[PDB]
Amino acid sequence: IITX
Amino acid sequence: IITX
Amino acid sequence: IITX
Amino acid sequence: IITX
Amino acid sequence: IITX
Amino acid sequence: IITX
Amino acid sequence: IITX
Amino acid sequence: IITX
Amino acid sequence: TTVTIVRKDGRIAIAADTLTKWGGGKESADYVANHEKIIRVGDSYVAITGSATFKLILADYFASLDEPPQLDSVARIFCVWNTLHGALKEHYYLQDLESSRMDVLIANPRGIFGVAAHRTVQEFSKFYAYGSGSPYALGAMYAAYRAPSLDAEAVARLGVMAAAEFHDESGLPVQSFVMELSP
Amino acid sequence: TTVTIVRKDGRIAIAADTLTKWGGGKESADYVANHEKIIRVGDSYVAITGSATFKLILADYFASLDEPPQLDSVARIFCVWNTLHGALKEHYYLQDLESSRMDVLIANPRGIFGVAAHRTVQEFSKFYAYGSGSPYALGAMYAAYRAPSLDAEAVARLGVMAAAEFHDESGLPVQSFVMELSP
Amino acid sequence: TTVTIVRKDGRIAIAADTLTKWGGGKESADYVANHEKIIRVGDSYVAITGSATFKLILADYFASLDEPPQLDSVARIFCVWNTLHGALKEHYYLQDLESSRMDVLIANPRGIFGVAAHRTVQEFSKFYAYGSGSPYALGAMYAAYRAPSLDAEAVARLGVMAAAEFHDESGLPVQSFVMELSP
Amino acid sequence: TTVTIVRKDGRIAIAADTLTKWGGGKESADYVANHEKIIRVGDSYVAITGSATFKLILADYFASLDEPPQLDSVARIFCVWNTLHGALKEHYYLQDLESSRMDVLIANPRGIFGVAAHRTVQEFSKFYAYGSGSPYALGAMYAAYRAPSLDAEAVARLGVMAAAEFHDESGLPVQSFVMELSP
Amino acid sequence: TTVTIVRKDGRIAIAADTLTKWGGGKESADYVANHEKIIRVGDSYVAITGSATFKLILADYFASLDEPPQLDSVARIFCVWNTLHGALKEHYYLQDLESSRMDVLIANPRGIFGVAAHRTVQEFSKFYAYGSGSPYALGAMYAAYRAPSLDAEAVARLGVMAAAEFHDESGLPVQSFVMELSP
Amino acid sequence: TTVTIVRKDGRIAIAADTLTKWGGGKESADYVANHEKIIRVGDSYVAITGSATFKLILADYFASLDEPPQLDSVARIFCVWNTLHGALKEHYYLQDLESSRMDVLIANPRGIFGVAAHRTVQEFSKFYAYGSGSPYALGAMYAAYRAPSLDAEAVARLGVMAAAEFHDESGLPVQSFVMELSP
Amino acid sequence: TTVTIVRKDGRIAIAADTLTKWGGGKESADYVANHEKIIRVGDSYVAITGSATFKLILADYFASLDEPPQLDSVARIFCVWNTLHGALKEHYYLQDLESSRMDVLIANPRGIFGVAAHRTVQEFSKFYAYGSGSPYALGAMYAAYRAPSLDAEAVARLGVMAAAEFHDESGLPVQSFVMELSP
Amino acid sequence: TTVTIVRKDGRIAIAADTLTKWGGGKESADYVANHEKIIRVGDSYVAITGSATFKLILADYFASLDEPPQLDSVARIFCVWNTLHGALKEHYYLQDLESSRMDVLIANPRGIFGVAAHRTVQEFSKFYAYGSGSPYALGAMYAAYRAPSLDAEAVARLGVMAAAEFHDESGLPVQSFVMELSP
Amino acid sequence: TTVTIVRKDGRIAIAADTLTKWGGGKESADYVANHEKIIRVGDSYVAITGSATFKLILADYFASLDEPPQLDSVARIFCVWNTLHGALKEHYYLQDLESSRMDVLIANPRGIFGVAAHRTVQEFSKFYAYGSGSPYALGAMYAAYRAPSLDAEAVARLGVMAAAEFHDESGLPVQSFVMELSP
Amino acid sequence: TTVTIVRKDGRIAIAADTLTKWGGGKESADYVANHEKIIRVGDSYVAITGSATFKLILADYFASLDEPPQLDSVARIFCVWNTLHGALKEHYYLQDLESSRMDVLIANPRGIFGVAAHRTVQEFSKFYAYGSGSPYALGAMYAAYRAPSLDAEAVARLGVMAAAEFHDESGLPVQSFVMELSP
Amino acid sequence: TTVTIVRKDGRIAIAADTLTKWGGGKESADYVANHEKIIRVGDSYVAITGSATFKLILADYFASLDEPPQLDSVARIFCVWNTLHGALKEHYYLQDLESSRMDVLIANPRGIFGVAAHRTVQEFSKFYAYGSGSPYALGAMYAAYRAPSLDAEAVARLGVMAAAEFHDESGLPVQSFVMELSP
């Protein structure tokens, strides 16, 4: 869970 | 809720 | 649990 | 709920 | 738990 | 529930 | 549950 | 928490 | 509710209290005109415990069949009830085995029966009782069943009275019916 | 809400309070124009407790039928309500037996009735009350019912006044209707 | 339980039902000899709701004081009860503000009062009722209070009867007392 | 357990079943030598429901007092039990009002009494029963109490028998005692 | 319930108790006419534990098949039960692997078998028991199995008696059947 | 664990299995030297179920008293155990009535007894068993008790063997002791 | 359960214990005729852990295919098992990736393999073990694998014996099979 | 698992550890023949973290396509993975955005990429690592990346070694591959 | 951790792994200087499982006593440990019976012992193992114990190796000690 | 993430940081080649917050339409987004009103807009910012907006810098774009 | 935080990052004057992870002792910390074994050590790292430790830089110290  |  |  |  |  |  |  |  | 059923000396009797509860509220037979908990279905009587709505559901359901059902053997009562359950779900908005949420006693001249909420059908040999008042009724009928001056209907009614005496979900008057055992 | 219904000396009456609640917020009849909780359906009056939305739903629903329904016997009221329930679910977004979430009293010249949320239909023999104010109303009507100077409508209204006196979900004015019992 | 208290035309009256509950079990006055829910403490009467044990605790407690307490003004009743609470905890095994777990009405010739479970002491001007039957009683007394043929004691008792009529935690007979208001 | 107590025609009787339970396990009087649930304390009999350990605790406790206590009025029984409770906590490892976790019936020549787990002390006028079998016993005694051929002891024992007939926590034989009412 | 099954000296036997439970309520064979927990299916006997309803379900289900099923090998019994399960769900309102919620012993001349609730089918070589009384029964049969004076049916029945002696879900009389092992 | 105790034909015997469990791990007598679950205390034998630590606690505790205790009547055993419990808490780090967390059987020449975890002390008249293997043992001993070729010790041991046959918390060998009943 | 698999010196072996568990209940090979946990599927052996029902499911499932499947490479076993899983759901009532709820070892002449419950298929180069006894078996085989006097089958069986020695879910006798590695 | 990927001086390398875990159980490359976590798909290498089953699923899935997919740009890898996800759900029993439950690195001559479990596709410019060992690997490669004596493959492998040194989910040997960057 | 202890052919040996864990982090003996898990206490060796802090706590505690303790019989070890526990709580901030949160093996010339976290003290007759690696070690030692070429220390060490082979909480090197059994 | 948008003196600008997070892990622009969080869609720029996957989803989605959408009025953006949401669910595996799980800013020559996760579309008159860094950015732009030496792009970028200065989910470099407002 | 410690070629070094976090908020050394995480205590350096408050607590605590403590052996550090813990609780409001909630590394000329939150004291032989950045640091130091051009301090600092490169709880500049190993 790769977030901006 | 009405019961006998 | 005896009540009035 | 009646059981054997 | 032994009960009367 | 019978298990090997 | 066998993992890498 | 360090364990043996 | 208390409902009772008795079989003694060639006669069969069935009885019920008449009190309706709404919470701790009491709706006695003095305020409710349609306070009877026993209905007729063919030549059987059916005494009902559970939600008060089931009185009317069964009346409507059994009325809607081609003819009324035979309720005079355990296997027969079972089929009737297994079908009924499906109908409670499909037409009447009911929600291990599923529960029909009602316990009933069934009296007719061929025998005395009970159906419990998970469709356990029993045939009784002397007496029985369903409903929350049931254990008070069982004790009373146990004490009175062999009294030679008390016929099946007296014993049935005595059961209901005992429950109304000591339990807050049962109330007098008692409604009851009697019939001859067939040969 | 308090709604009441009475049958006495050849007359039948029905009454209701007029207060709407939104939480602890009070919306009295002085601020809400359409504060009436009794609707007409054929020659019956229907007094409603529950969500305020049900007043409008029943009005719309009954309006949409071919003719208005007969609401003058326990079995008939039962069918009407069992169908109604299905409609609440299919058209009006309602969510042991399922609940219709409303309690109503029904008055017409052939009798006084009630339908509770699980479709228990009752016919009453003197008076009754539904709604959260209901016990205050029952007590008041118990005290006044045999007063020879108080007709059915006075007794019905007195029930509502008692509830509004002591309970925060009921409010004056009282709306009421009266009719002759038929022969 | 229902307990009531009334002050009308120079008289003061207090009343109570007589039914004891154990679950849904009913222990009526017919089976329990010591069924009275009102006790005497000085020239005051104290009607008690809550656990049946509190009848005996108060009797024992008040008995044990040097003289009985003055219960004839709001501030006085308050001190008495604040002390009492400490004693319930230190001697009698009671467990925002802590609760004394009982609601009582107090009648004496100087006035009519109530103490609720969080030691809210009130003086009443016409009538009031405590206990689970209380709203039925309040409605009945609201209807009957201005009846010119019903003295304070009739009204008090009527309150209890109304509750016993419709609620499963109250039961007849009614025990009541009456006294003259002092000048 | 079922325990019963009866007062009729100048005699007083007290009775109990003899079955001990450990889960669903049954320890009948045929396997357990010390199966009696009634103990003697002065000229009173005390029939005990609850943990089997309480039989021995009470015996030890009452033995340890200077003399045995008077258990012949409601107020007296109350004091005895209020003190007892403190001792159950300080010496015997017991854990709204606190519970003593036992219900007992007490018979002596001056009357028949009960103490429930929150120290509600009652005096009974005809009969009563405590324990999980209690409602079966109440019904049976209700049916038999006015039978002119059944003395107090027969009625007491009939209560226990009814419970053992229908409930899985009671078992025969019945132990009972009888005494003459004093003048 | 206790059900047992034994194979010894060229004979096969099967046995069951006769007590029905409803909570802590006991419905003995003395009150219930249709108290048998073993049914016949072809030349097999099927002893059932679980809800009492399953007795009637299996009877109805097996009755409805073209001919009765072969229940004489582990693989066969397995197919029969895998199909059955689907039917319990589709017609009879049953709710890792799903459970059929019943354990049964099956006796016929070709062998002794058991089917547990997750369709584990076992063939037994000397004896076994199912039901909550099962460990008492297993102990008794372990002690008696090699007794040369006790045939297969005596051993089966002894199992049930042991369970009824010590456990509250089993009750006498014992129902049993015996047959010759085939060659 | 299974422990058993028997009294028959003027002899008394006590027995135990020898398996220790740590989770699903088995520590048989073949790996653990100090595998005995019965200790001597005066001329009594005490067979212990529960945490394995209790074997050592009781040994240490009883060793520390001025003389060993009399364990030959129900009242005596009760005092010993009530004191013991306090010591388990004050010295040995133990955590309705509190539990001592062990069940023990006690054999001496004056009788056979048991003490369960809430200090219920029982005297037994023929045989009994404690521990998770206990129902298997009870069944076996029920079948063998009246066998005229099996003395008290054979029966006691047979109980343990039955439990080790069918239950995963019991294991052979069996340790047992026997003594003459005193006159 | 313990199952093991070994490949050594041109032979391949597979082994399993024979104990069935039902709770803490033990059903040893001495009471259960069909106690084998390994089945034959083509020229492979499949040793199964998990619910006992899976033995029969796989036997039925593989029997029902056009021919038995090739289980001799990792990719092949994977397909077989991915299809199998769908069938467990559609026909046999099974409930990150879904689990098949069983772990198996597979031996044939072309290699030794395992499939764990989330369809992880592994090929083993020396030995492995599945089931709750598995770590005891791994340790024992680690110690014995290079012993020059122990062939593949001895090592496999030693694994199972170790687990039965110390763990309560494994039991002797050991069932095993051996084959020659192919060229 | 640790997987790494590096791009340096015109070469691209990818590496992985070889240890499989089952709980705290270690299945090293010494026991598992098919221990490789990198698969070939066209001229790309795909290193996988997550359930061991995904190695086989991807191999089966990519094998089943008309031709192998282009995995050489971020948008392309994204489409491939979005489709794949649907197939994991429809054919392979996978259960804000849904997760594919695996993180992979992808190396081919046109670049180095990663796909995380929620289909975040990244192109890397120097090096990266996925898996639970990943931060150990990132630190080691951060220290060694600019070492002029260490080519891309040395750095990739050093990452894995670092993780195996300090973390219990990674284990030697290291499997790795190297290729020329295309022009 | 794995710790082992063995007694064979007149010699006694004790062994331990050397890996410290912090989460999934590994702190091998190569990074930690004080990696030994066995301490000396008098002429006993004590191998410790649990928090790594307990090594130092025991060393400090035993150092602080007047002389070191006798740890050469079960009863003695018990007293030492029961006192110790109190000290863990009063001086070292430790938090049915309370747990000391450590399992240890104790070797001296008079025997081999273990103390588990609830102060269960056991004497072992051949070998045993504590720690999470324990079942792998038990299996290995079961296989090797009767090997005539492997002395007590070889067997002890082999246990630890087996655990380090297959479990992620144990690691090589093995530390071990050996001594002669006394006469 | 921080994204900002500014409209000032006839110019419009949009900016974003370039840091990707994976837990507490930082993936800076120095390691990730495709670190841009703004995409082009027609003549609009779309800056994205939320999962990193949404960058690629929107790019693929908008690419797949017949022509790119008009994003230049609030009603238009709303339709585009309402349709989009349905596609996120049907094609891209997204899971009061449903959330699209992303907040975006949209710049084009006809205005500056934002769409929040529940499809609230806003048009901004001076500046705004979305993303966890957003309040730092708002503060900075509030301070700088009226600075006459700072054009729209300087202000947009300053917002991102402020967030990167103080918050652990934003990182330099800043990516930004600028365009002329249309007439 | 990341803190590191190294021992190499006759020198000892310790290092730390300088970033303080408050949630996701970053308080870099550029905004916080007292950003140092290493304190001096005698001739030891103590690097602290955990709440920022512990820097000050330890400084205050050690300052308050008669002389500073010896922190140069594992046993000595243990006593210092066990006492310290009691003080954290009695004076500084700290809340299996209790946790001191901080991990520290300790460097002095006689060695390199660590104390983890449950007072596990370790002596290190080459390098180690504590704090959430610790695995990144371990990997980097693993790669660089044997580089002949990097002294102990370079390696220590490199560890911190690696963590600050990839993890959001660590930040540059690095603070470090170096000393000569004593003889």
mmCIF file of N, CA and C in Angstrom, chain L residues 75-119:
data_model
loop_
_atom_site.group_PDB
_atom_site.id
_atom_site.type_symbol
_atom_site.label_atom_id
_atom_site.label_comp_id
_atom_site.label_asym_id
_atom_site.label_seq_id
_atom_site.Cartn_x
_atom_site.Cartn_y
_atom_site.Cartn_z
ATOM 1 N N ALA L 75 -37.136 -9.865 60.488
ATOM 2 C CA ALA L 75 -36.025 -8.927 60.869
ATOM 3 C C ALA L 75 -34.835 -9.684 61.414
ATOM 4 N N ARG L 76 -35.113 -10.718 62.178
ATOM 5 C CA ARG L 76 -34.035 -11.471 62.732
ATOM 6 C C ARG L 76 -33.227 -12.165 61.699
ATOM 7 N N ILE L 77 -33.912 -12.801 60.753
ATOM 8 C CA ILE L 77 -33.249 -13.529 59.671
ATOM 9 C C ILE L 77 -32.404 -12.562 58.862
ATOM 10 N N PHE L 78 -32.937 -11.380 58.645
ATOM 11 C CA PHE L 78 -32.191 -10.375 57.957
ATOM 12 C C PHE L 78 -30.887 -10.046 58.627
ATOM 13 N N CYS L 79 -30.866 -9.854 59.927
ATOM 14 C CA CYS L 79 -29.593 -9.534 60.595
ATOM 15 C C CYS L 79 -28.621 -10.661 60.477
ATOM 16 N N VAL L 80 -29.127 -11.860 60.728
ATOM 17 C CA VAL L 80 -28.272 -13.020 60.685
ATOM 18 C C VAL L 80 -27.608 -13.054 59.315
ATOM 19 N N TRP L 81 -28.403 -12.870 58.263
ATOM 20 C CA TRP L 81 -27.862 -12.971 56.919
ATOM 21 C C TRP L 81 -26.932 -11.806 56.519
ATOM 22 N N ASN L 82 -27.230 -10.605 56.985
ATOM 23 C CA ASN L 82 -26.332 -9.497 56.715
ATOM 24 C C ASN L 82 -24.945 -9.686 57.340
ATOM 25 N N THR L 83 -24.901 -10.282 58.523
ATOM 26 C CA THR L 83 -23.636 -10.569 59.164
ATOM 27 C C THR L 83 -22.908 -11.709 58.443
ATOM 28 N N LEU L 84 -23.667 -12.779 58.192
ATOM 29 C CA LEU L 84 -23.222 -13.909 57.422
ATOM 30 C C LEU L 84 -22.524 -13.512 56.120
ATOM 31 N N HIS L 85 -23.117 -12.587 55.403
ATOM 32 C CA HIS L 85 -22.536 -12.189 54.156
ATOM 33 C C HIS L 85 -21.116 -11.677 54.320
ATOM 34 N N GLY L 86 -20.918 -10.825 55.328
ATOM 35 C CA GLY L 86 -19.563 -10.331 55.636
ATOM 36 C C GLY L 86 -18.577 -11.456 55.893
ATOM 37 N N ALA L 87 -19.053 -12.477 56.579
ATOM 38 C CA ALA L 87 -18.228 -13.612 56.893
ATOM 39 C C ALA L 87 -17.937 -14.458 55.666
ATOM 40 N N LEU L 88 -18.920 -14.667 54.794
ATOM 41 C CA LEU L 88 -18.645 -15.353 53.529
ATOM 42 C C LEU L 88 -17.497 -14.687 52.791
ATOM 43 N N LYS L 89 -17.462 -13.377 52.827
ATOM 44 C CA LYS L 89 -16.378 -12.643 52.182
ATOM 45 C C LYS L 89 -15.056 -12.717 52.929
ATOM 46 N N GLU L 90 -15.045 -12.482 54.242
ATOM 47 C CA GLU L 90 -13.777 -12.418 54.987
ATOM 48 C C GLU L 90 -13.165 -13.811 55.199
ATOM 49 N N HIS L 91 -13.964 -14.862 55.434
ATOM 50 C CA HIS L 91 -13.423 -16.202 55.859
ATOM 51 C C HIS L 91 -13.597 -17.299 54.821
ATOM 52 N N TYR L 92 -14.608 -17.202 53.960
ATOM 53 C CA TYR L 92 -14.943 -18.321 53.059
ATOM 54 C C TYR L 92 -14.746 -18.134 51.557
ATOM 55 N N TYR L 93 -14.152 -17.001 51.194
ATOM 56 C CA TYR L 93 -13.734 -16.698 49.841
ATOM 57 C C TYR L 93 -14.840 -16.525 48.799
ATOM 58 N N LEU L 94 -15.969 -15.963 49.198
ATOM 59 C CA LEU L 94 -16.980 -15.437 48.257
ATOM 60 C C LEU L 94 -16.474 -14.209 47.561
ATOM 61 N N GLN L 95 -16.916 -13.919 46.327
ATOM 62 C CA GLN L 95 -16.344 -12.775 45.599
ATOM 63 C C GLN L 95 -16.911 -11.304 45.768
ATOM 64 N N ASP L 96 -26.908 -4.312 41.758
ATOM 65 C CA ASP L 96 -27.125 -3.335 42.875
ATOM 66 C C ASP L 96 -26.524 -3.557 44.337
ATOM 67 N N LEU L 97 -27.186 -4.374 45.151
ATOM 68 C CA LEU L 97 -26.556 -5.010 46.351
ATOM 69 C C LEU L 97 -25.731 -6.255 46.028
ATOM 70 N N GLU L 98 -24.676 -6.559 46.791
ATOM 71 C CA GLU L 98 -23.811 -7.733 46.524
ATOM 72 C C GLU L 98 -24.634 -8.945 46.632
ATOM 73 N N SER L 99 -24.259 -10.071 46.059
ATOM 74 C CA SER L 99 -25.057 -11.294 46.192
ATOM 75 C C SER L 99 -24.385 -12.284 47.114
ATOM 76 N N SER L 100 -25.162 -12.991 47.910
ATOM 77 C CA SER L 100 -24.621 -14.077 48.721
ATOM 78 C C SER L 100 -24.571 -15.388 47.942
ATOM 79 N N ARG L 101 -25.146 -15.377 46.740
ATOM 80 C CA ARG L 101 -25.119 -16.504 45.785
ATOM 81 C C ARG L 101 -25.776 -17.764 46.199
ATOM 82 N N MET L 102 -26.778 -17.664 47.046
ATOM 83 C CA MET L 102 -27.479 -18.834 47.495
ATOM 84 C C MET L 102 -28.862 -18.387 47.806
ATOM 85 N N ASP L 103 -29.818 -19.278 47.558
ATOM 86 C CA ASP L 103 -31.182 -19.047 47.991
ATOM 87 C C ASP L 103 -31.526 -20.137 48.941
ATOM 88 N N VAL L 104 -32.151 -19.783 50.059
ATOM 89 C CA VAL L 104 -32.499 -20.785 51.056
ATOM 90 C C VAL L 104 -33.905 -20.627 51.510
ATOM 91 N N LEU L 105 -34.492 -21.746 51.907
ATOM 92 C CA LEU L 105 -35.724 -21.764 52.665
ATOM 93 C C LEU L 105 -35.396 -22.144 54.090
ATOM 94 N N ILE L 106 -36.152 -21.563 55.005
ATOM 95 C CA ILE L 106 -35.958 -21.796 56.421
ATOM 96 C C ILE L 106 -37.266 -22.142 57.049
ATOM 97 N N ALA L 107 -37.316 -23.286 57.681
ATOM 98 C CA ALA L 107 -38.524 -23.733 58.399
ATOM 99 C C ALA L 107 -38.221 -23.837 59.885
ATOM 100 N N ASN L 108 -39.089 -23.273 60.709
ATOM 101 C CA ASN L 108 -39.148 -23.671 62.112
ATOM 102 C C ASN L 108 -40.567 -23.614 62.640
ATOM 103 N N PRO L 109 -40.772 -24.005 63.883
ATOM 104 C CA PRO L 109 -42.133 -24.014 64.352
ATOM 105 C C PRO L 109 -42.871 -22.668 64.360
ATOM 106 N N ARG L 110 -42.138 -21.551 64.406
ATOM 107 C CA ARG L 110 -42.758 -20.241 64.430
ATOM 108 C C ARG L 110 -43.079 -19.729 63.024
ATOM 109 N N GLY L 111 -42.736 -20.427 61.964
ATOM 110 C CA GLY L 111 -43.062 -19.929 60.616
ATOM 111 C C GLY L 111 -42.241 -20.510 59.473
ATOM 112 N N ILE L 112 -42.597 -20.159 58.243
ATOM 113 C CA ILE L 112 -41.791 -20.536 57.063
ATOM 114 C C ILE L 112 -41.278 -19.332 56.267
ATOM 115 N N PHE L 113 -39.999 -19.369 55.937
ATOM 116 C CA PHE L 113 -39.330 -18.210 55.424
ATOM 117 C C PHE L 113 -38.412 -18.562 54.271
ATOM 118 N N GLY L 114 -37.964 -17.525 53.583
ATOM 119 C CA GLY L 114 -36.975 -17.677 52.530
ATOM 120 C C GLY L 114 -36.006 -16.523 52.552
ATOM 121 N N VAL L 115 -34.773 -16.786 52.130
ATOM 122 C CA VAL L 115 -33.813 -15.735 51.894
ATOM 123 C C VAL L 115 -33.222 -15.943 50.542
ATOM 124 N N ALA L 116 -33.411 -14.962 49.694
ATOM 125 C CA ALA L 116 -32.848 -15.031 48.374
ATOM 126 C C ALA L 116 -31.454 -14.410 48.338
ATOM 127 N N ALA L 117 -30.782 -14.547 47.218
ATOM 128 C CA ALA L 117 -29.363 -14.227 47.164
ATOM 129 C C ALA L 117 -29.018 -12.766 47.424
ATOM 130 N N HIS L 118 -29.945 -11.822 47.225
ATOM 131 C CA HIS L 118 -29.631 -10.475 47.638
ATOM 132 C C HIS L 118 -30.249 -10.100 48.967
ATOM 133 N N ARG L 119 -30.358 -11.086 49.847
ATOM 134 C CA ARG L 119 -30.834 -10.930 51.203
ATOM 135 C C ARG L 119 -32.263 -10.400 51.323
#
